[PDB]
Design a protein around this ligand. Structure first.
Ligand SMILES: Nc1ncnc2c1ncn2[C@@H]1O[C@H](COP(=O)(O)OP(=O)(O)O)[C@@H](O)[C@H]1O
Ligand SMILES: Nc1ncnc2c1ncn2[C@@H]1O[C@H](COP(=O)(O)OP(=O)(O)O)[C@@H](O)[C@H]1O
Ligand SMILES: OC[C@H]1O[C@H](O)[C@H](O)[C@@H](O)[C@@H]1O
Ligand SMILES: OC[C@H]1O[C@H](O)[C@H](O)[C@@H](O)[C@@H]1O
Lengths: 343, 343
């Protein structure tokens, strides 16, 4: 049995799948965090090696035989490649783990799970990113620069607009579009501080990007219960997300438009659980972005969700990096959830 | 002889002025940081006592003779109610230091040095902030929230605009108002990196707020040398600083608009060195904002810079606090660099 493995990590979820020669998924094991910014490359190496061994036991596979390849689909933030270093520390500490390594990106590992010839992903999790891989080599992207330089339409951004808007309102630097009450109270309560000064501590001493972006869930709840300000912030995240697509539009190979689905857009990230709250902003940004840019027309799009971990894409790409091609059941890996054709 | 002290503290450099009954300066001593975050409060207490005693000795005043008052003008604003405590530990440990104390914001100390009545303090350094002090002493503000949640029109905000605009241009998420070329080259040079990926380490792993805000100076040169885009960023900075004034306007005591000087606005910070580049933006924001809000006065304003320590202001406030009006040469204390009367 020749085994190929993929890893999903870098963000909040971490996971390993192992795949056989024939593309049959052998086992899945969940793991501890592999965000290399919060944890070092020492721990990263440790949790990856545990994860894979546990999965090997689970699959009924020879514990001593090294993986043919291991495809690591990781949300970089900075591809400052210490991904190079991760591979080096990996083959240094555990030489029996795998014969070969591939570090890719979360976007490329997702795309790889859904289609055999590239496509388009829109990511909205704690951060955001939009990426494209054409049927030929060509790649292209918009805005995966993290929290200090963009992330428009992410959980961070939704959270940041939320506090930015109350700060500016009280200050009289800008008038809010709708009442400040619910969010102002949600804020103080979530961060457990009485006033605006209390919020500074969480920004510059503490700073917990994870806690901060968590605030998005409270805006989502408030929006669901009809608080206009909350509904507003989710509309604008819809636009920002829609704009990422508009941005990459000129770079898309025309054949990707010309099917029954039309342009398939893979939607990765938990913010998409609030799709109903993003829908209008998203539809708007696209609708105004096809007047300004292209009479060279795509007629429709459909949105898709993954049904297996991006680790499956990882495994796929890890095999591709060596000799092999892993068979893939692309119908099973992703499903349609929304469709729209411009009228 | 009655003697009246002030301290400019809270930042990295401290100062003490001993002022006599008819306003002449008796002694002055420099000191290091008096920031309780960086140093703890005990060390702050020690260093204040040390500075003041060194000022007494210079003046031929024994350590056992207390001041009639001491006005501590303490930056690191907003959260300066560790002041009640710094005063207690002071009159606990060193009872002969002073017979009276006043904790002042750095803004209150600052204006009290330039004019007798209230005014506005407008800061644009690494960060930015705007504080209004009324004739009656009541103080309020706009901004001061730091690089993650405002600092509009500061050194940091300027550098950040520069690199955001070019990031969004290459991404095609937002077309720049003017050509990206000059600034793009300035960026790559200043952070000494090959590409955008290289800028990302300077924002996450190797982050240095001071280094990053330093990039402002480069945009100043660009704007000086004639580059359309660098000029534009400095116009927007001017606007944001303008809008800080517009924010507090509704709170100003009408009588503050009434001098021959009009509204006194003290400018603190190094970005003010680029006044020529902020001027148009500053004016445009003041024009369209004083119109929105019925201009029942606000006929004019003059912008000032300081020429003495805010400690002089501190001395003055400490003395008023105990019923003594300290003679104060406001002309020697600060100079006016611009005057504008709306027409
Ligand atoms: N229903 C929801 N609506 C909007 N945001 C959500 C929802 N559930 C989770 N989130 C946000 O998802 C973010 C985490 O993104 P996720 O894709 O789960 O992980 P990561 O992006 O870190 O890999 C959290 O910051 C949280 O606020
Ligand atoms: N001539 C200038 N024009 C514009 N910005 C400047 C100039 N000189 C210095 N700066 C900016 O001022 C910032 C430092 O501000 P300063 O007021 O001196 O100290 P701080 O704000 O840290 O107390 C630096 O980030 C620098 O980029
Ligand atoms: O996860 C979505 C995005 O979050 C952040 O912006 C990261 O810099 C980027 O690599 C990631 O893809
Ligand atoms: O120094 C200018 C300003 O910079 C930062 O924004 C600080 O939060 C603020 O308190 C300070 O006054």
């Amino acid at each position: 049995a020749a085994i190929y493995g993929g890893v999903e990590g870098g963000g909040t979820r971490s996971e390993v799948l192992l795949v056989s020669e024939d593309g049959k998924i052998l086992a899945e094991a969940d793991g501890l965090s592999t965000n290399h910014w919060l944890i070092g490359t020492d721990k990263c190496v440790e949790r990856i090696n545990e994860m894979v061994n546990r999965a090997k036991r689970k699959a009924g596979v020879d514990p001593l035989v090294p993986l043919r390849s291991l495809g690591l689909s990781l949300s970089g933030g900075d591809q400052e490649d210490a991904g190079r270093i991760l591979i080096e520390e990996l083959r240094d500490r555990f030489p029996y783990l795998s014969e070969s390594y591939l570090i890719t990106t979360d976007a490329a590992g997702s795309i790889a799970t859904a289609t055999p010839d590239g496509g388009v992903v829109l990511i909205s999790g704690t951060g955001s990113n939009c990426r494209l891989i054409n049927p030929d080599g060509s790649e292209s992207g918009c805005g995966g620069w993290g929290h200090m330089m963009g992330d428009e339409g992410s959980a961070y951004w939704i959270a940041h607009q939320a506090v930015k808007i109350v700060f500016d309102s009280i200050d009289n630097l800008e008038a809010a579009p709708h009442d400040i009450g619910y969010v102002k109270q949600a804020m103080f309560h979530y961060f457990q501080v009485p006033d605006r000064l209390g919020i500074l501590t969480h920004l510059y001493r503490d700073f917990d990007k994870c806690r901060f972006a968590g605030f998005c869930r409270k805006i989502a709840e408030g929006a669901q219960q009809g608080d206009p300000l909350s509904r507003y912030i989710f509309r604008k995240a819809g636009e920002m997300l829609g704009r990422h697509i508009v941005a990459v539009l000129p770079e898309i190979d025309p054949v990707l438009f010309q099917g029954k689905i039309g342009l398939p857009i893979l939607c990765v990230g938990s913010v998409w659980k609030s799709w109903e709250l993003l829908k209008e902003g998203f539809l708007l940004a696209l609708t105004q972005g096809r007047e300004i840019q292209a009479q060279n027309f795509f007629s429709s799009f459909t949105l898709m969700k993954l049904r297996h971990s991006s680790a499956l894409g990882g495994a796929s790409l890890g095999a591709r990096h060596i000799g092999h091609l892993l068979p893939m059941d692309y119908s099973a890996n992703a499903i349609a959830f929304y469709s729209y054709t411009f009228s």
